[PDB]
Amino acid sequence: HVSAEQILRDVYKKGQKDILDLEELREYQRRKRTEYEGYLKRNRLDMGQWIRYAQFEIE
RNA sequence: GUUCGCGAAGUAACCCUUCGUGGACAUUUGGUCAAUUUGAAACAAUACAGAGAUGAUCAGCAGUUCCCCUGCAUAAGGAUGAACCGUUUUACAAAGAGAUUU
Ligand SMILES: [Mg+2]
Ligand SMILES: [Mg+2]
């Protein structure tokens, strides 16, 4: 039987569906810092991004 | 080189030369910069696509940015010039209940 809730359950179920040396580490680091410094040069605010980027440098 | 002397020598006679000699005049340019590759413009060609809020096709104005280009520009253009679309955990406590230990 067809109702709107069963349509939206169908839509929800539809849309729901190796560092080995130091140079690979430096590339991972350079790429991630370009990411975070980009999203912080654009939005100077948003302290949560600052805490995540600081936790990244802790890791 | 010029000029004022001061001596000698040639003719001298008060001039004119050769020569030595004291003074005067005139007195510090240019480089931030070496002459083809190795101290720094850049575009353009072959290949792929064929422009944002869309169900489709479009008008735009902004904003933020350690991106700028054309412009005489504080005007206006550059796809509304473009990038924007991701990753997301703790100022962490109170009352009650069920098991372990003392
Ligand atoms: Mg714009
Ligand atoms: Mg504009």
Swiss-Prot record:
It comes from the Eukaryota. HAT repeats lie at residues 27-59. It is found in: Nucleus. Belongs to the NTC complex (or PRP19-associated complex), composed of at least CEF1, CLF1, ISY1, NTC20, SNT309, SYF1, SYF2, and PRP19. Present with 2140 molecules/cell in log phase SD medium. Belongs to the crooked-neck family. Involved in pre-mRNA splicing and cell cycle progression. Required for the spliceosome assembly by promoting the functional integration of the U4/U6.U5 tri-snRNP particle into the U1-, U2-dependent pre-spliceosome. Also recruits PRP19 to the spliceosome, as a component of the NTC complex (or PRP19-associated complex). The association of the NTC complex to the spliceosome mediates conformational rearrangement or stabilizes the structure of the spliceosome after U4 snRNA dissociation, which leads to spliceosome maturation. This is Pre-mRNA-splicing factor CLF1. The chain holds residues 12 to 77 of 687 of the full protein.
